[PDB]
Structure formats: C-alpha cells, structure tokens
C-alpha cells in the first residue's frame, strides 16, 4: 500500500565512489519495475535470473539498491563471473546473481573541467572481494618485503586512485552511474511486491 522509494536512489544528487558503494535496503512497499525499464534513458539494463515484466509480478523479502560511479569501460565488470579492477577490488556480484544492473552516462553531472577528483576506486588490494563485500580502508599498500607504516614511497602506495573525470574524455573514460537491484528471497515474510 506504499511506493518503494526508487527515485531517491536513481535520482540522487550525489553518488558514492565505487570502493565505498552505497546500499539502500528496501522493505515494506510496492515496487513498479515497469516504470524503471520504460524510462528507457539507460545505456545498460540487464537482468539475471529474472525478467522486468515478469518480476513486476513477484514478491521478495527485501530489495537492495546498490549505487556508485565507475568508468564506462568498467560497466561490463558489473556482472556475474567478471574479473578486473572493479569486480576484484571494488564491487563484486555473486556467481549466482539474481537481479538487475542499470547504468547510464553521467558525464553532464560527474565530470568537470580540470577534473573531478571526488570519485575514486581501489587500485591495489592483496585479495579479491567476496560478493557484496565493501572495503573502505585507506592503509598504505605494501608491495615489497619492507613494511610501509603509513608513509608513501617505493613499494608503498596509497591504495585508491581518482577517476579525475573530465567532460572531454573518451566515452569509455566518462563517468557512469550504476544501480544494482538485488532481490533477497529469505524464509521470512515478503515485504516488497509488484
């Protein structure tokens, strides 16, 4: 008897960095995913294990809307079974992912002349993230046998890199806003329905 607040995720004024990706938990509401697809202002809208029209006739215990910004050429990493900097060290979908990945170009919003340095991604990590794992540490990364102890230097690197988005970049380097819809099916009362 109440609308799911998808707009405050999709239409948010600022998006998270991918390494610190945002998660909105969605419960106790009615969600219309037909308006989402029929917006048709999305460069990517891909569903795994579901179909938009079909899932509008379904219920789930919870829905997660994860949102962040990556480069265009990295959007293909937001999918099950992918590897690469973003999937490995920033935002990992499970192999059995059930849900949808939505992306659109946000160059007019997230890039600026001289570079937008607000958006970052994790470049160095010793091991891959588990699915839906989120790592926000900024410890200096040790690439050799000598410990770093918080100071940059040879073999000692700050683990995050800025995208530095500029509007005249090639499209593959321009910012894309991403929302990942995950449909949690628990053995519990379903609270999100079409």
């Amino acid at each position, epitope marked *: 008897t109440n609308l799911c607040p998808f707009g405050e995720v999709f239409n948010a004024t600022r998006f998270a960095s991918v390494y610190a990706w945002n998660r909105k938990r969605i419960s106790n509401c009615v969600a219309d995913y037909s308006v989402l697809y029929n917006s048709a202002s999305f460069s990517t809208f891909k569903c795994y294990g579901v179909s938009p029209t079909k899932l509008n006739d379904l219920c789930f215990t919870n829905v997660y809307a994860d949102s962040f910004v990556i480069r265009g050429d990295e959007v293909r990493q937001i999918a099950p079974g992918q590897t690469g900097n973003i999937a490995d060290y920033n935002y990992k979908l499970p192999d059995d992912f059930t849900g949808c990945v939505i992306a659109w170009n946000s160059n007019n919003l997230d890039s600026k002349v001289g570079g937008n340095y607000n958006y970052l991604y994790r470049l160095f990590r010793k091991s891959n993230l588990k699915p839906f794992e989120r790592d926000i540490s900024t410890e200096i990364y040790q*690439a050799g*046998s000598t410990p770093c102890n918080g100071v940059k230097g040879f073999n000692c690197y700050f683990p995050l*890199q800025s995208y*530095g988005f500029q509007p005249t970049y*090639g499209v593959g*380097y321009q910012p894309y806003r991403v929302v990942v819809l995950s449909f949690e099916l628990l053995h519990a009362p379903a609270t999100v329905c079409g």
Partner: antibody, heavy 118, light 108 residues
C-alpha cells in the same frame, strides 16, 4: 638491488612448449600486477600477459589459449608457460612490475630470448 | 585506443631542445600516459608516468606534459647518452597501447 631475472628462453620447434621464469628480489610478485612484454626482432614492445595481486589474469589476443601466466609466491617467482609456439613468438621476453597510474612499468628484467624455428 | 607518435625519427645535436609528441585517438586521463626510453639490445626504462611525473633517478632534463589527446616528452638539453628510441604508453588498460616510437639520432 631491486631486480627481476628471467630465464628459460631458447630454441624450440613450432608447436612445442617452453616455460619462462622470472625470479624477483626487492618486490613481492604475489602483491603486484606482474606482466610479460615481448619484442620481436626489429619491432616494438607487445604486452603479452598480466597477473593481478588478487590472482586475476589477462592475455593479449594473439596468445590466448596458448600461454598461461602463473606464479610461485613461496619462490617469489613469475612464470609464463608457452604452448603451441609459433615462429611469430620469436622475441625477447621481459617480465615487468606494473604500477598502472601509480607508476609505470618501473622494474624490468634483462630479457630472455625465445627462438621458434624448425 | 591508438597512440600515434611523431616524428618517427628526429635528428638533433647535443644541447638541443627535443620535443616528441604522442597523440591519442580519443581523450584519456593524464594519469594513463607513460614515457619509456630504449637503447639497442637493452630493456626499456621508465622515464615518466602519469604524463608529467618524473621517475625517481631519471635526469631532470626529461619532462612530460600534455592532456586530453596530446602529450609531449621534452628533453631540454640533449646529452650524448640521450640518443635512443622513445615510446609512449597508455596504462590502466589490458591490453595497453604503445606509440610507434621516435628514434632520436645524431644530426650531421
């Protein structure tokens, strides 16, 4: 001194196999993006393969399904297994440490020479 | 992404100012571009990364700049050990792109 030392190159027939090694000191192979780059006689550099700190790998198209990059952390060593070798693969092979935008390929081996011929 | 390096070869004398350009086909972050030097029979050597950062140990007469699609390597006072080939490289991608290279050779 920080160094990478390649070995394993030599003469090999077309269709044959060869494993290259790159023994590292002063950087930890398992904690770095580690790459193989080759240079055929008279040509420029060609990136061949990479292994990420987390263990993901990638390969140039011309080498996919024939070459395998790998590593032994206990021996701080990087490897390139090369199968189904072709005359094209004749080159000097370098291992290098890749820092991406945090630094270039700053550490290179001396190279090891692979000659593929019948 | 393709990198077009010009000129393919350049003639210079000791003490000259030398300028080598690398044109990218689309517009790339400045942090993606590195410059390397190579001499015959030797491994490449990193000179500059992120388009303008001098690699520690590299003489200060080497300097990088540029942005967008157009990047430049400048050797301000050419020294005899500088006659060599130079390559630009586009990092952060697999495969990376290499420019065709510029051979700096002795004018006479």
């Amino acid at each position: 001194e920080v160094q990478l030392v390649e070995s394993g190159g030599g003469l090999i027939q077309p269709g044959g196999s060869l494993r290259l090694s790159c023994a590292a000191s002063g950087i930890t192979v398992g904690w770095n993006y580690m790459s193989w780059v080759r240079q055929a006689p008279g040509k420029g550099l060609e990136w061949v393969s990479v292994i990420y700190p987390g263990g993901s790998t990638d390969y140039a198209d011309s080498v996919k399904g024939r070459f395998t990059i790998s590593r032994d952390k206990s021996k701080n060593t990087l490897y390139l297994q090369m199968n189904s070798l072709r005359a094209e693969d004749t080159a000097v092979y370098y291992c290098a440490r890749d820092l991406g935008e945090a630094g270039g390929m700053d550490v290179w081996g001396q190279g090891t020479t692979v000659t593929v011929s019948s | 992404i393709q990198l077009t390096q010009s000129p393919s070869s350049l003639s210079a004398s000791v003490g000259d100012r030398v300028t080598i350009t690398c044109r990218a086909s689309q517009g790339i972050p400045s942090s993606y571009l590195a410059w390397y030097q190579q001499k015959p029979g030797k491994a490449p050597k990193l000179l500059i990364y992120a388009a303008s950062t001098l690699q520690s140990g590299v003489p200060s007469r080497f300097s990088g700049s540029g942005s967008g699609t157009d990047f430049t390597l400048t050797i301000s006072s050419l020294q005899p050990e500088d006659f060599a080939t130079y390559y630009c490289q586009q990092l952060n991608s697999y495969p990376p792109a290499f420019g065709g290279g510029t051979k700096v050779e002795i004018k006479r």
